[PDB]
Amino acid sequence: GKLPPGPTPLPFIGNYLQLNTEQMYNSLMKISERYGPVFTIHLGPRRVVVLCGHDAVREALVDQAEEFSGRGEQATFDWVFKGYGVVFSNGERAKQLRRFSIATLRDFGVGKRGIEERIQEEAGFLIDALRGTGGANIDPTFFLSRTVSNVISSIVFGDRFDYKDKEFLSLLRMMLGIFQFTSTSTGQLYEMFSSVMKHLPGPQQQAFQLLQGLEDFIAKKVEHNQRTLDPNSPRDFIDSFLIRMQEEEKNPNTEFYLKNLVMTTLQLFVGGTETVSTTLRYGFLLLMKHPEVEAKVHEEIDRVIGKNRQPKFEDRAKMPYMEAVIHEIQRFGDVIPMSLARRVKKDTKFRDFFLPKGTEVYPMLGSVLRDPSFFSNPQDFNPQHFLNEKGQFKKSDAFVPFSIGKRNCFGEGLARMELFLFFTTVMQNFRLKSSQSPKDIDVSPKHVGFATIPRNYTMSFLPR
Template sequence: MLDCNHILNVYTLTGVVGLLLLYWFWRPYKFPPGPRGIPFLGILPFLGKYSERKIAKWSKSYGPVISLRFGRKDFVVLNDYESIYEALVKQQSKFSSRPKHTLPIMTDIAKGAGFAVLDYGEFFKSQKRLGLLALRGVGIGKQSIESRVLEEVTYLVKAIASTKGDSFYISKVLQKAISNNICSVVFGKRFNYDDKLVEDIIDRLLNGLKDPTTTLASRICTLAPFLKYLPPVSFIISRFKKKLETSLNFIQEKIDTHRATFNVEDLRDFIDAFLSESMKENSYGFTDRQLIFYIRTLLVAGTETVASTLAWALICCLHYPETQNKLREEILNVLGSDGKITMSYKSKMPYTSAFMQELMRFRTLNPISLPHKTNEDSELKGYFIPKDTTVGPNIWAVHNDPDYWDEPEKFKPQRFIDADGEFIKSNHVIPFSLGPRTCLGKQLAQMEIFIYLVSMIQQFEFLPDPNSDKLPEIDDGINGLAFLPYPFCLSAKVI
């Protein structure tokens, strides 16, 4: 016969389990629906490498606005253009903050400094204005941004030509060229391609995006921040910090040199512009730490996004050689074999514009944009979104929505050419996201992609690696904070 204590223990255990299950499955009133996963981990074990694709698949069952349990926290993910536009544009004042766990590895190192992780407010707006002025070359330096890009093109073309048709890694060359554009804006100078110190500095800065192990740790920590304290993630983070330290010291040295030669009447670059602002009254927050991590953001985002987009472009040219031929035909018709490209020619190149837009749709570089946070209780598409809820725009889902795109899994630049041969601009291609937190370097990136792509296709025919019987992978890549191609080789034949 069971004693009373045993019966009491059974009832107590049953009650505790019941309360835990009730807590696990409870949602706020009118909160978006979605899968809950398993206790403690939520849906983390079910995401796989391409979480944006799994979430988009779930949205077909639950609707475009869904909630997901990551660890012990509920996230809201937006999976169509309408809900993203409603939140980030129409209700931008409510959906433009950043959660504390955004890029948790970098947040721990930077102690809240930088740009990408800043919360929405007046300081964020002042930092964004400063960055936009620098990236547009307004009142900073004596050379326009376009002229800097055009100057760098000559070095890129020379570097590619020096391979003499042999197999080489194009990504490394592109990285050097694109990083020089940002270095010119930030430091006031470009660096030689054989400068091993600068190459190492950039490599260390980009480690968080390009190293598969580090990118996996970043994704894990973004979704479940508590795991950053546990092995093996904690070991990966420690290694990342050591690599980053050298780069941060390099940036500090550049700041010190600028401060020693500073002239408020002659602002040479972004560092000078920042130092000038720091000397004004009410310049709270304009510290060296803020500047260091702001520069780090500019170098990382401004280098790898454009370099990888161009690398994906060349991979598409290898897989679909007819697109490379069409690009070259249009370019030669407009420029000839030795004409110099400028942005003024873009309107005369509809197929090139269509190729670029399809490229950014087909290979979405930031599948799920950096998370946002609600500043206040909000309503979206009939759902209640409480204050401080993390909200993630699923850009990949928008770019691959079968209800909007015909055969979204295929690369088809012609989908953006009308019956008259004119380019069709689509508002549903949003690689830079929407709203106040749209990518700071959007205009510069678009300029670089156009000028570099045109210049390369004008001068070279890109061919598969003669030492391999396989083309570079087009459907798989490094998928962390960004979707990057695996390193690959090709050859370039001078035309």
């Protein structure tokens, strides 16, 4: 009949003195060693229940999926979202908007053919862009992010952005800037002291201008769609949401208004871009550090696909090792370590612990991906974690970078496709060369907070 144990919290500051804001994951894992896998931390005034290891996260988010179905809080993001949009909402907003969004993604591709060809075409444009560097030593960041973003930008804006559009570069800078901030010390300090810091000068204010610029843009692209709309023929996601908005103009109790559109669209545009981009950027660094994996990936491509035709999604089933590399890239990468905070919808009983209504939950996706029970060498990049003795692909229940449950990533279909069609096509046409010897390439993250971000590196893409 008691809430999980945890260190003694001082008023307002919580467990600030017992935690390091630069390495929140390490700080929570140190406390897991004393108080067990399910403990209570006070991030300032924010009472949070932290779940560590697979069993804890799965038991809570899957077995008791309905009880842990509520959405928590991410203070930097909730500065511009304020509970609006598909991602940061609860109840009838999170049920209506999650329903509409998954639907409106299938009717414009996602998981089908309409998006597979659209990703293949875009993959062919990344090939051009990298062949256009003439094998010069470059920063892959914006080359990869440009490609990735255009896939989701097709669904939400109608068409793709052109690689030279300076507003596009500016929007991608905004997306990288916030994923950088929320992963820094000041970003994680902001999760504790948002109520004060929101009004104080600093790095939090610059990050806000990045979110405002992103919101300003979506509102601009929505207004255009309004005065140029075809009510019987929707061009994109904004257009389909604009149809429903009118079919609800008579319902005062609707969740389909202008504010929820600007937000749902923004949330997707960022959530589709920066997540898959970070995974790609970390991926190529992991491959340069390990030539042996690149070589076997190359062997599988030469054998299965060839040097001619552009790889297609269905080739994945005839390609076991490749799927295992992408899986280990996502695992080691740990793109979003502490998920996107959950909240218990009603008073719960979880393993002899009481969690009152409204209690924020932190599912540590990283501790599940780095679980020593489900993985042989959780600290190393070794695709064999997802590969049995006969070289076949082996699944794992601890593989959760997309999370699990009732509020999981409904962009998993698009994300896994993008990663297969971008990694493979680049690996077929190009061989990777670093700037330094593989024994020196640092694979440890530069920042770990909301997101896990790799180090700033440079490389060259040489043809085959």
